[PDB]
Amino acid sequence: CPLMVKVLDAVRGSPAINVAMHVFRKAADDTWEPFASGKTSESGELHGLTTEEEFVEGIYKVEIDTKSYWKALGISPFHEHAEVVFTANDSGPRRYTIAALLSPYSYSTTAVVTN
Amino acid sequence: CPLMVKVLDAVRGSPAINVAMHVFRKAADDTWEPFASGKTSESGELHGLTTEEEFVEGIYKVEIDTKSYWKALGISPFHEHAEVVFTANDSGPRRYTIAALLSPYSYSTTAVVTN
Numbered sequence: 437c438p439l440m441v442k443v444l445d446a447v448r449g450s451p452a453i454n455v456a457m458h459v460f461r462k463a464a465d466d467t468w469e470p471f472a473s474g475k476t477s478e479s480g481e482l483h484g485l486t487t488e489e490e491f492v493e494g495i496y497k498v499e500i501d502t503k504s505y506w507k508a509l510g511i512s513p514f515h516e517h518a519e520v521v522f523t524a525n526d527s528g529p530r531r532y533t534i535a536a537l538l539s540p541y542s543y544s545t546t547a548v549v550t551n
Numbered sequence: 552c553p554l555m556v557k558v559l560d561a562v563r564g565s566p567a568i569n570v571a572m573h574v575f576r577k578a579a580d581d582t583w584e585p586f587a588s589g590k591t592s593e594s595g596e597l598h599g600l601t602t603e604e605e606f607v608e609g610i611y612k613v614e615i616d617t618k619s620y621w622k623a624l625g626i627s628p629f630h631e632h633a634e635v636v637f638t639a640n641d642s643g644p645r646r647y648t649i650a651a652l653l654s655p656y657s658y659s660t661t662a663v664v665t666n
């Protein structure tokens with residue numbers, strides 16, 4: 437699992453379940469092409485997005501549909517979504533966890549990059 | 552001042568000075584039209600991006616160039632930028648402060664909306 441995404445809810449103190457997201461890779465045309473997608477599990481985690489062979493260096497964007505998450509709960513959000521844009525670099529072995537912590541008017545994201 | 556952006560550095564405990572950012576507005580054809588741009592001052596704040604008449608209803612994106620900020624300090628950060636996308640003024644004019652707190656592998660954004 438070269439890339440995993442985990443989403444947490446700071447209002448309810450729980451995993452953010454059934455959160456949809458799409459992952460894009462930047463194309464030579466400087467356009468965003470779909471690469472992978474899914475919805476978070478009951479643990480708030482989305483595994484199996486890609487494979488080691490498929491996850492090459494480049495610029496990736498994870499677009500998390502936070503607005504639909506807050507709407508299903510009845511809570512009025514600020515953001516249309518949460519975009520996380522980063523460069524994947526293949527110098528030495530690296531596995532990536534992208535995490536997002538969600539509030540209606542705030543979000544935090546961090547990367548946990550391990551060998 | 553209907554839209555202000557404040558950026559802080561969580562490594563140094565200081566305002567994030569001279570941080571560039573670009574604001575875009577979603578056009579009718581679903582493309583991002585340039586709206587305004589600027590750099591944070593010595594207080595980490597960017598004022599004067601727009602006016603009440605220019606800042607109409609719509610979907611806006613703030614793209615903060617955190618990568619150039621970190622690289623100028625000798626740090627290789629994870630993210631290409633910190634983006635904030637939100638609907639503005641849908642229930643009438645509001646004043647928006649967009650704040651971002653920056654670390655090399657993490658950022659947070661929040662919005663303070665007043666009427």
Ligand SMILES: CCc1oc2ccccc2c1C(=O)c1cc(Br)c(O)c(Br)c1
Pocket residue numbers: 442444533535536537544545546548
């Ligand atoms: C931006 C997402 C985020 O917000 C936080 C606030 C306090 C502490 C950790 C985090 C955090 C994480 O990165 C995080 C990452 C992993 Br992996 C976890 O298993 C758990 Br749990 C939390």
Ligand SMILES: CCc1oc2ccccc2c1C(=O)c1cc(Br)c(O)c(Br)c1
Pocket residue numbers: 557559648650651652659660661663
């Ligand atoms: C994501 C930006 C952010 O991160 C935080 C972490 C702890 C406390 C406040 C913040 C915070 C702010 O919103 C913030 C907003 C204003 Br306005 C400020 O003048 C100051 Br200073 C900080």
Ligand SMILES: [Ca+2]
Pocket residue numbers: 488491492493526
């Ligand atoms: Ca790789």
